[PDB]
Fold enca beta-lactamase.
Amino acid sequence: MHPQTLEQIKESESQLSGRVGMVELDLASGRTLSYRADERFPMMSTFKVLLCGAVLARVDAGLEQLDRRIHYRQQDLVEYSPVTEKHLADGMTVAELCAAAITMSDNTAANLLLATIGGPAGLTAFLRNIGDNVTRLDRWETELNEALPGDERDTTTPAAMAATLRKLLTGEILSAASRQQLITWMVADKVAGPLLRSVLPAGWFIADKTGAGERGSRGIIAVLGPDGKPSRIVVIYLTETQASMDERNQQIAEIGAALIEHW
């Protein structure tokens, strides 16, 4: 038993004594539920879905290949690189790196793919070219998770994120096969268990990507729906709190439960 979603968000924000942003966007109708929709939040690892979107655009155009192998050095490793550190000798394909970046949130994998599209400014240009004038990436992993208040670097707004995900995952920017490939990596997410997944009824579709950052930051972007098909995009960001991590998970889960109850 939960209050209406917006009311649950207010209560969660109070408990965390922080800042919470949300957009629920219905794919068919364009109906939205929103809260702080136009305020900036740090993306943290949620940016990795955009990164892979830009890589797949280059695959579509013949400039990149998914089976291309990339070799890197022990020097190139940053903190939290659970997949990439296992393949130091043999390297990884572009496709393998996308899967690592999305399913495990491997940081070195993200930085490797970033280098292929022209770094942070490369991703930001891609975004501008597809009609997003808000979202911006300025730094690499792991500096981009610093989440200083008032700092506009490595931020998006819930409204802009939701709109961009709608274009990438369900629009005409990527080919049919690339769209499906991006969603498939999201469905296979291995590190988002304690969040939306923990309150999701049986039979429901979910494809998500999580983020965490400094200053009590946590986020999640998701495509979800009843009866095994995606029907809405959900973006949740929270920041500027001193809450424990699994306390931040719990509040996201709670907002999720209200969202599902009052679907």
Q: What stands out?
A: Residues 66 and 95 are 5 Å apart (CA to CA). Residues 1-263 form a domain with the Beta-lactamase fold (CATH 3.40.710.10). The chain has eight helices and nine strands.
